[PDB]
Design an enzyme around this catalytic site. Structure first.
Site, PDB file in Angstrom:
ATOM      1  CD  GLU A 102       0.127  36.819  76.973  1.00 56.11           C
ATOM      2  OE1 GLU A 102      -0.252  36.194  76.079  1.00 56.11           O
ATOM      3  OE2 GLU A 102      -0.364  37.192  77.838  1.00 56.11           O
ATOM      4  NE  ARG A 103      -2.837  32.932  76.627  1.00 51.20           N
ATOM      5  CZ  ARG A 103      -4.245  32.627  76.588  1.00 51.20           C
ATOM      6  NH1 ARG A 103      -3.966  31.095  76.437  1.00 51.20           N
ATOM      7  NH2 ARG A 103      -5.190  33.056  76.855  1.00 51.20           N
ATOM      8  CE  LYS A 140      -4.975  42.098  74.651  1.00 53.74           C
ATOM      9  NZ  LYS A 140      -4.609  41.860  76.214  1.00 53.74           N
TER      10      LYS A 140
HETATM   11  N1  LIG Z   1     -10.149  37.515  62.899  1.00 53.56           N
HETATM   12  C1  LIG Z   1     -10.409  36.343  63.541  1.00 53.56           C
HETATM   13  N2  LIG Z   1     -11.399  35.453  62.961  1.00 53.56           N
HETATM   14  C2  LIG Z   1     -12.068  34.316  63.749  1.00 53.56           C
HETATM   15  N3  LIG Z   1     -11.594  34.063  64.949  1.00 53.56           N
HETATM   16  C3  LIG Z   1     -10.911  34.903  65.527  1.00 53.56           C
HETATM   17  C4  LIG Z   1     -10.541  36.281  65.031  1.00 53.56           C
HETATM   18  N4  LIG Z   1      -9.666  37.013  65.972  1.00 53.56           N
HETATM   19  C5  LIG Z   1      -9.894  36.136  67.195  1.00 53.56           C
HETATM   20  N5  LIG Z   1     -10.573  34.947  66.797  1.00 53.56           N
HETATM   21  C6  LIG Z   1     -10.884  33.946  67.794  1.00 53.56           C
HETATM   22  O1  LIG Z   1     -10.984  34.784  69.202  1.00 53.56           O
HETATM   23  C7  LIG Z   1     -10.065  34.097  70.116  1.00 53.56           C
HETATM   24  C8  LIG Z   1      -9.222  35.060  70.727  1.00 53.56           C
HETATM   25  O2  LIG Z   1      -7.816  34.598  71.318  1.00 53.56           O
HETATM   26  P1  LIG Z   1      -6.645  35.639  71.356  1.00 53.56           P
HETATM   27  O3  LIG Z   1      -5.397  34.862  71.586  1.00 53.56           O
HETATM   28  O4  LIG Z   1      -6.548  36.479  70.336  1.00 53.56           O
HETATM   29  O5  LIG Z   1      -7.113  36.453  72.548  1.00 53.56           O
HETATM   30  P2  LIG Z   1      -6.545  37.867  73.169  1.00 53.56           P
HETATM   31  O6  LIG Z   1      -7.545  38.657  73.516  1.00 53.56           O
HETATM   32  O7  LIG Z   1      -5.223  38.089  72.599  1.00 53.56           O
HETATM   33  O8  LIG Z   1      -6.071  37.435  74.727  1.00 53.56           O
HETATM   34  P3  LIG Z   1      -5.198  36.391  75.480  1.00 53.56           P
HETATM   35  O9  LIG Z   1      -3.747  37.393  75.290  1.00 53.56           O
HETATM   36  O10 LIG Z   1      -5.444  36.373  77.083  1.00 53.56           O
HETATM   37  O11 LIG Z   1      -5.108  35.027  74.707  1.00 53.56           O
HETATM   38  C9  LIG Z   1      -8.868  33.269  69.017  1.00 53.56           C
HETATM   39  O12 LIG Z   1      -8.348  32.201  69.763  1.00 53.56           O
HETATM   40  C10 LIG Z   1     -10.110  32.937  68.030  1.00 53.56           C
HETATM   41  O13 LIG Z   1     -10.576  31.599  68.423  1.00 53.56           O
HETATM   42 MG   LIG Z   2      -4.687  36.591  73.273  1.00 54.13          MG
END
Ligand SMILES: Nc1ncnc2c1ncn2[C@@H]1O[C@H](COP(=O)(O)OP(=O)(O)OP(=O)(O)O)[C@@H](O)[C@H]1O
Ligand SMILES: [Mg+2]
Ligand SMILES: Nc1ncnc2c1ncn2[C@@H]1O[C@H](COP(=O)(O)OP(=O)(O)OP(=O)(O)O)[C@@H](O)[C@H]1O
Ligand SMILES: Nc1ncnc2c1ncn2[C@@H]1O[C@H](COP(=O)(O)OP(=O)(O)O)[C@@H](O)[C@H]1O
Ligand SMILES: [Mg+2]
Ligand SMILES: [Mg+2]
Lengths: 474, 470, 470
Positions: C189-190, C163
């Site tokens: 958020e963090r 996200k």
């Molecule tokens: N386009 C991408 N290419 C490669 N790795 C990705 C990509 N998008 C996300 N990731 C991986 O997936 C992880 C998802 O982390 P992210 O912070 O986006 O999570 P989230 O779903 O927003 O949740 P939260 O807010 O709880 O952290 C990233 O840290 C990364 O390692």
């Molecule tokens: Mg995230």
């Protein structure tokens, strides 16, 4: 005595001392000028729900009862306007200038006042007009999941309502105002606005306004049906009405129920939906048909509120996102959709063709379920599969493009008798529109026969016209 | 007797305080009649049913009508007995509400009529009889494969739009036409449109004079929708006790009775149970279905319809009612959308009176062979779909050939279909049914085209339709 | 005037105003105490009224930690709601919930304008609507669910689905180009993400066009509740009084309702739904309704919504779904498959996907892609039950193209250069539709499936296939 102080304030709810002569449902007014309804009478306190901005009220404020029940202003001048559940304009353009007022809490027409449903309600949508007919006075339910082409059906039926002399009220409950503006503009650009009335209850308006909104909707349709005109009423969401009533009940400390809903939910929805009827010839012949909407998560139509509404209604239209993304729009499930006025609310040619259409669709519905796995089959199974495929293909139509009933019955007659056998499936959609154009230019006499007679034209003329068009098509 | 004053209003629930201490008993009836003294007040007439005692001379009551406009301090008067529906010959050919007051404009029942309290102790063990008598309906499927029994409870199960109401209405007409017995109809939360259409259809049929109807409308508080079935049962009770004949009782839907019970429990403040249902469900259903018993004098046979919420026979109300049935007939939407009318599934509909000694051995043999052919057809249809009818051998070919005809001939036109398709209708006695099914089984009509069997009555009507088609 | 504290239960405190004056709802109260002995602790606190009680008593939500409070302390009355400093001065600076600055860079003087945070929403006549597309350069959103300028954008997904990557990529791309004021307000958020984004914006220089307010998750519920309203208040002035276009970014607005339930449990409200307070829809509707674009100014808002257990059935996401013009749902399964981003092609659709708005060819390509993906979505179940060998030739072709189509939707991102070390690409809409049409017509039958994985433009697909040695 009659005067009394407020002893609590919170979350749109108050409690008051005194008021020993108050009545259930009575309107009560504060020093701030905001209005509210008394709903609970206790041994020494009264439970008040507030119909407006409540932040100004403080302890020690004196509250007094108006002495009347809430009345919605009624008149011929409301048409085209946009109004609150209360009788106050929100569209600008100054006061609406109604004639008089009617109480919202009123009794419904009982037995020996109504009459059987015998005249259709045209929507211009081939699938529902053919296989799930609607007649005036019928309380047809529409239910489905979010964003599955629900409101397109009501908007198309309101646009097509131009043909019939019906006021088509649209009541929005708990929705974002920008959606209200968008739908108002969509209505206005297609010219339907002058026979419509929009009632808007914002998601941010105090909950009792959302509690009272459907009653303000039925009040105007009830007045019109008393005057003798046909009325159509659309509720965009009952689930938000249930949520508003649950919230306003729980704040009052009334005991909960199956899913924290209070005990009065079925009572309230039956009170609302029972006013829709078809008054007898003696009363004047008016009608108040309804198309309530119900929202459901993941298509679990077995939940409490869908069960209540489906047991109150005279039929349902089940819409599924599966058929929606399958390429079949509007996504109507023929098998799960039922209407208990099926044979009476149609013109004779529509009945005659639609019976065989439904038979073919019913057979295909079972054969297609697993015929796909087998590549090689006998010829007659192939014929039935092709019939079902062409059947489903014809039903596809454009959005905001209602179709006159006679072109519907002509194209469905072309389908049922197997005139589309030569046409490859992809060509069928172009065939429908070019066929419409050809009958508009050349085969007008069939349309004249249908519009005058209200019955299928002579077989030879229809067959010759359809084959004459088939000659040109490539 | 001494008046009582209101203390609380919470919608359907109302509370009264009998200061002097002479309290009414449970299930009593309380009357509220008010005339406005100032221009601010309203005029209201209300009936209240006591449900609980809360001490300090206060009682908690459930209203049978809308409670809008109540005022604290108004007097309540106690009748001294449960809600008393008037009974006798004056109740034939009329429509009543839950309180037993006439809805029809034809007139008002006078004080001459005898009144029966609705709430009454059940019949005892020694009184009841055990004899079994079959009831003939004239419907081929019902008479052949699911006989109904005098004094027994018969259930109609199915989804929406399958014809349960059409079946019950046409059965009422057929019974009144041929058997001529008294019948009573109770509408528990019926659609006003369907109630009015039923009233007009029965009036046109000339049957209303023999029957009696009571309605509890959906827009009424749940307590009235609960008590309407009991008032209908009280009408049948007086007819059976004093006139001593074979009364019938039709009930529109028990599902709404259970729902009304749940709503009244939720309002009264009792903890939920099962799927949101009231704590006391089995007891109420048991009472309503155990006052319907055939003594030596009279049967009080009942036909009852129930809706399956999600095509699952596990909801507490369908299961509790399922426990109580002698015969169950379940209606399928697939049959309803097929050309086969009525929509009754043969295999899943059963009656405990299908024993060979009760119906006769010939009836048993023909029914068994019919079901055997149907099962073989259902199994063979899967093969037919992929490989066709030509792949299977001669025995399977003959089996399916007979099965199609038997499925068609199970249908018949009836008098109520005049509105829907304009055909007159037919009545087939049981012996003609078993004769026709034995004949089609033995296969004298293998030459006839299958279409002749679609919607006729007697088998000579198949012959006549085959003559007509050519 | 002062009031005495009499109760304290976690976040909630109970002031009593015995002076004869009472604060209105939403008023702000001040607590300032000097330790009289070494046992007492110096405390500075602010309390907002949320409810009223009979004996002058009021229930107040505390904005900060309640530890160290003693009964009998005196509470100062401000006489007005929480005031936030808004104006041109706010650009660049970072503020907390009460309006105090967070960065050590400086302070806000008394001369600055401060206005209250609570007010009614815009009326019906003020709103306006348009259909202008807002290009993002992301293949999935551009081709299958375009965003619109002035339209609400929502991001749905669970924990660890991708996200935040979308939030940062979008903020980089659009904030580099648009000359609109940006307001950022992280809801629970963090804090590390906030610090990293602050450093990134200082690198980008966009801080001069941006104003920021933070509510950390570790902060008591009150701050997480009011912080989004404060950010909205600043965006309100920027939208209306300045008459300049503004963008409002909010992360995981769900924390607002989470904190609301945290304090509602203490406030004495009866439970509802899945533990959610009864007043969920009213409050969430108020907050979302205030975020509207009028004729005076426009607000393009991009938000993200946390889902408690990856199930969208929860009442808070369900209520949120009604308040969004464009929605993209993120699925954990796509994240596990390796396809990034995790937007599901068959559940995301904006209000702008109309033939007139996007053009005929774009609409036709989008709908053919969706149809093929649905067909594959059912074919996978068919394969699981029957096997992958029983499919028909055309079914084989359908699966063949469906695999490539779902693979090509992945895009190499900008911010992912840190996480994986690839450059990143910005894909025009015309390139997306042309490439999708080319693959739909099957011009690239020869290429392997993996060549379509994580590439910007179809020419990069060709280059990757060249690198494979095809
Ligand atoms: N386009 C991408 N290419 C490669 N790795 C990705 C990509 N998008 C996300 N990731 C991986 O997936 C992880 C998802 O982390 P992210 O912070 O986006 O999570 P989230 O779903 O927003 O949740 P939260 O807010 O709880 O952290 C990233 O840290 C990364 O390692
Ligand atoms: Mg995230
Ligand atoms: N015939 C059609 N062809 C293509 N798309 C259609 C058709 N009918 C409806 N739609 C789609 O339906 C969508 C409209 O959403 P829908 O009417 O289901 O909303 P809703 O959830 O009922 O809304 P509301 O919040 O107003 O109750 C649009 O995206 C539109 O493209
Ligand atoms: N035997 C039948 N003959 C003619 N029409 C029928 C028959 N059975 C069902 N129908 C059709 O289905 C409808 C049955 O309605 P109803 O009996 O109320 O269904 P349900 O009992 O499932 O609510 C009728 O309107 C009629 O058009
Ligand atoms: Mg909707
Ligand atoms: Mg029925």
């Amino acid at each position: 005595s009659d005067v009394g102080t407020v002893i609590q304030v919170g979350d749109g709810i108050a409690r008051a001392h005194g008021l020993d002569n108050v009545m259930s449902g009575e309107l009560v007014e504060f020093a701030n000028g905001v209005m509210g309804m008394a709903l609970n009478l206790e041994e020494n306190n009264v439970g008040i729900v507030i119909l407006g901005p409540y932040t100004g009220i403080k302890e020690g404020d004196e509250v007094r009862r108006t002495g009347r029940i809430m009345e919605v202003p009624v008149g011929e001048a409301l048409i085209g306007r946009v109004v609150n559940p209360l009788g106050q304009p929100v569209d600008g353009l100054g006061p609406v200038e109604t004639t008089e007022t009617r109480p919202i809490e009123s009794r419904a027409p009982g037995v020996m006042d109504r009459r059987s449903v015998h005249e259709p309600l045209q929507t211009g949508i081939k699938a529902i007009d053919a296989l799930v007919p609607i007649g005036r006075g019928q309380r047809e339910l529409i239910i489905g999941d979010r964003q599955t082409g629900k409101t397109s059906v009501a908007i198309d039926t309101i646009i097509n309502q131009k043909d019939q002399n019906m006021i088509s009220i649209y009541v929005a409950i708990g929705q974002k105002e920008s959606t209200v503006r968008t739908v108002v503009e969509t209505l206005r650009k297609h010219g339907a606005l002058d026979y419509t009335i929009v009632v808007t209850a914002s998601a941010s308006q105090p909950a009792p306004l959302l509690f009272l909104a459907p009653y303000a909707g039925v009040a105007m349709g009830e007045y019109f049906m008393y005057k003798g005109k046909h009325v159509l009423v659309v509720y965009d969401d009952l689930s938000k009405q249930a949520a508003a009533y649950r919230e306003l009940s729980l704040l009052l400390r009334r005991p909960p129920g199956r899913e924290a809903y209070p005990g009065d939910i079925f009572y309230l929805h039956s009170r609302l939906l029972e006013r829709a009827a078809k008054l007898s010839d003696a009363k004047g012949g008016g009608s108040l048909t309804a198309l309530p909407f119900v929202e459901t998560q993941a298509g679990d139509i077995s939940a409490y509120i869908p069960t209540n509404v489906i047991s109150i209604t005279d039929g349902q239209i089940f819409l599924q996102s599966d058929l929606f993304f399958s390429g079949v729009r509007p996504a109507i499930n023929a098998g799960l959709s039922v209407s208990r006025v099926g044979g009476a609310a149609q013109i004779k040619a529509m009945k005659k063709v639609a019976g065989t259409l439904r038979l073919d669709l019913a057979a295909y519905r079972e054969l297609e379920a697993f015929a796909q796995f087998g590549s090689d089959l006998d010829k007659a199974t192939q014929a039935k599969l092709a019939r079902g495929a062409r059947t489903v293909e014809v039903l596809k139509q454009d959005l905001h493009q209602p179709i006159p009933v006679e072109k519907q019955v002509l194209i469905i007659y072309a389908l049922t008798r197997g005139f589309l056998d030569d046409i490859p499936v992809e060509d069928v959609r172009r065939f429908e529109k070019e066929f419409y154009l050809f009958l508009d230019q050349n085969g007008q006499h069939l349309l004249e026969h249908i519009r005058t007679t209200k019955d299928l034209p002579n077989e030879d003329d229809l067959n010759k016209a359809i084959e004459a068009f088939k000659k040109t098509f490539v | 007797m001494t008046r009582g004053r209101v203390i609380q209003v919470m919608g359907p629930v109302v509370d009264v305080k009998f200061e002097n201490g002479h309290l009414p008993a449970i299930y009593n009836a309380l009357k509220i009649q008010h005339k406005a003294r100032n221009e601010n007040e309203v005029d209201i007439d209300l009936t209240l049913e006591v449900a609980l005692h809360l001490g300090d001379d206060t009682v908690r009551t459930i209203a049978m009508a809308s409670t809008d406009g109540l005022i604290r301090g108004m007097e309540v008067i106690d009748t001294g007995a449960p809600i008393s529906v008037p009974v006798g010959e004056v109740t034939l050919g009329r429509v009543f509400n839950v309180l037993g007051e006439p809805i029809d404009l034809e007139g008002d029942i006078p004080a001459d009529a005898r009144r029966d309290p609705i709430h009454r102790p059940a019949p005892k063990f020694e009184e009841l009889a055990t004899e079994v008598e079959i009831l003939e309906t004239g419907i081929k499927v019902v008479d052949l494969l699911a006989p109904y029994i005098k004094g027994g409870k018969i259930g109609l199960f199915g989804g929406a739009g399958v014809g349960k109401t059409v079946l019950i209405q046409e059965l009422i007409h057929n019974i009144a036409q041929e058997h001529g017995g008294i019948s009573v109809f109770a509408g528990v939360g019926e659609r006003t449109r369907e109630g009015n259409d039923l009233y007009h259809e029965m009036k046109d049929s000339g049957v209303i004079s023999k029957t009696a109807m009571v309605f509890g409308q959906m827009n009424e508080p749940p307590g009235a929708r609960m008590r309407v079935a009991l008032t209908g049962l009280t009408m049948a009770e007086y007819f059976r006790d004093e006139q001593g004949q074979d009364v019938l009782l039709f009930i529109d839907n028990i599902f709404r009775f259970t729902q009304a019970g749940s709503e009244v429990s939720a309002l009264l403040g009792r903890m939920p149970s099962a799927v949101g249902y009231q704590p006391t469900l089995a007891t109420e259903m048991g009472q309503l279905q155990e006052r319907i018993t055939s003594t030596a004098k009279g049967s009080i046979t009942s036909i009852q319809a129930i809706y399956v919420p999600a095509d699952d026979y596990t909801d507490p109300a369908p299961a509790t009612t399922f426990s109580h049935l002698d015969a169950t007939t379940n209606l399928e939407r697939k049959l309803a959308e097929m050309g086969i009318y009525p929509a009754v599934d043969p295999l899943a509909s059963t009656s405990r009176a299908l024993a060979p000694e009760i119906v006769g051995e010939e009836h048993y043999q023909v029914a068994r062979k019919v079901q055997q052919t149907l099962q073989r057809y259902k199994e063979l249809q899967d093969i037919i779909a992929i490989l066709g009818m030509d792949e299977l051998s001669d025995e399977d070919k003959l089996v399916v050939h007979r099965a199609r005809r038997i499925q068609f001939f199970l249908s018949q036109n009836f008098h109520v279909a005049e509105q829907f398709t304009g055909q007159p209708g037919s009545y087939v006695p049981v012996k003609e049914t078993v004769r026709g099914f034995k004949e089609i089984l033995e296969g004298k009509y293998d030459h006839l085209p299958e279409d002749a069997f679609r919607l006729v009555g007697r088998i000579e009507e198949v012959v006549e339709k085959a003559k007509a088609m050519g």
